[PDB]
Every structure is written in structure tokens, then in C-alpha cells.
């Protein structure tokens, strides 16, 4: 059902510290190799006054290299699809909430993404654009109340040297009942490959792989 090469089509609509925006995206990836690239274009609210880095993990857990000994909730969830709900709590009280509804027609995945953020200090690294990139991370996947969840301790590298912390809590929900996996981990590496001066056009890439915790 999930093809070796899958195209991506998306629209993100939201607001950060009251600044409304719309970003549409087109891309391609290799679900089985857990790699993807998106070409993102700002359609409304240009120029964005907050760091682009906060948005990137909202722009598909179907793009993960899953070992055969771990059930793949995301690929199994199709053709029907799945949705996700996420809260992103920053160390300085900035907070974002995002939802994504993921569908698929032929060889293309479609996402309708809603993204809202608030309480970012005007002099913080988000609003002042002091974020360089996200550190690679490990998402701990687990089941609660018969539903797939993912927690991740995220960190944005800052100009100057330090880290700026964010806690991600995602809830994943397939459109049909599908085999739920046992607790595992997804390693991630998200990077902006290129961008124009005000991030009106962004080339975004993610490489991710599933595995069990390497503790016996």
C-alpha cells in the first residue's frame, strides 16, 4: 500500500504570538528508508517574525525505517490514514500545539496541519531568531489507553553556544484499528537544507529509524 517512493502535499495554517501564517509544501521521500525532503513556501504572513525551526517537526511517522521485529503502526494505518496531536512546551514558557491529518491518494501523502504558538518572550531565541537547528533526538514510542504516544526531549542549538529546551508529547491515532507496537524508539535528524533570506522558501529534510532501547 505504501510505495517505495511517496510524494508529499501539505498546507499548514496557524499563528505564532498572534502572527497568522499559511505555508504550503511539496516533497518526496522513501518511507522504507525513513528519508524525506520537503519544499515549503510561505503563502500568508510573510515575512515570518519567529524562528522557522519551531515549525519543522510539524511538516509523518510513515517516513521511518522500521525493523521487521517492530510493528509499523504508520504504514499499516494506510490507505485510510492517521492523525497526530502534539504539544511543544519550551523552557521559557513559549508553547505550541499542532495537529496533522494524513491522507493518501495514489503515490501522494496529503497533510492538513494546524499550528499555534503563544507566550514566546519578545526577547527570547524564537522571536529574536537565535536558533541554529534542532539537535538529533530519540522519540520514545509507547502505548497508553490503547493509543500510540511519542515523547521527545528536544533541544534547539542557539547562536552563542547553548541549548534551548522543548518537550514534545505526541498522540498518534490511525483511522482504523491497526496492530499497536510494543514500546520502541525512533531516532530523528531534522535539518533545513537551504532557505532564502526570510525563510519564504525552505528545503527541509528528515532521516529517521526505529529500534528497541539498546539496554538489555
Author numbering: 3 to 61, 65 to 221
Sentences from the paper on this structure:
eCGP123 is a bright green FP engineered for extreme stability, and was developed using a two-step process. Phanta was isolated by expression screening of a library targeting amino acid positions 62/63/65/69 and 191/192/193 in the bright green fluorescent protein eCGP123. Phanta contains the substitutions Gln62Met, Thr69Val and His193Gln. The protomers in each protein are typical of the GFP-superfamily and consist of an 11-stranded β-barrel (or β-can) with two small helices forming interconnecting loops protecting the chromophore from bulk solvent.
In contrast, eCGP123T69V underwent very efficient reversible photoswitching (~ 92% photoswitching depth) and had ~ 10 fold increased OFF rate. Presumably the histidine is charged as it interacts with side chains of the conserved Glu148 and Glu215. In eCGP123T69V and eCGP123 the side chains of His193, Glu215, Glu148, Arg66 and a water (H2O91) form a planar network of hydrogen bonds and salt bridges beneath the chromophore. Although the Thr69Val substitution results in reorientation of the Arg66 side chain in eCGP123T69V, the water (H2O91) changes position maintaining the network of interactions beneath the chromophore observed in eCGP123. The aliphatic side-chain of the valine substitution in eCGP123T69V can no longer hydrogen-bond with the Nε of Arg66 allowing the NNH1/NH2 of Arg66 to extend towards the imidazolinone O2 forming a direct hydrogen bond and a water (H2O144) mediated hydrogen-bond. By comparison, eCGP123 contained a single species decaying with a fluorescence lifetime of 2.3 ns whilst eCGP123T69V contained a major and minor species with a fluorescence lifetime of 1.33 ns and 2.62 ns, respectively. It is possible that the chromophore environment of eCGP123T69V can exist in two emissive conformations although the structural data appears to show evidence of single conformation.
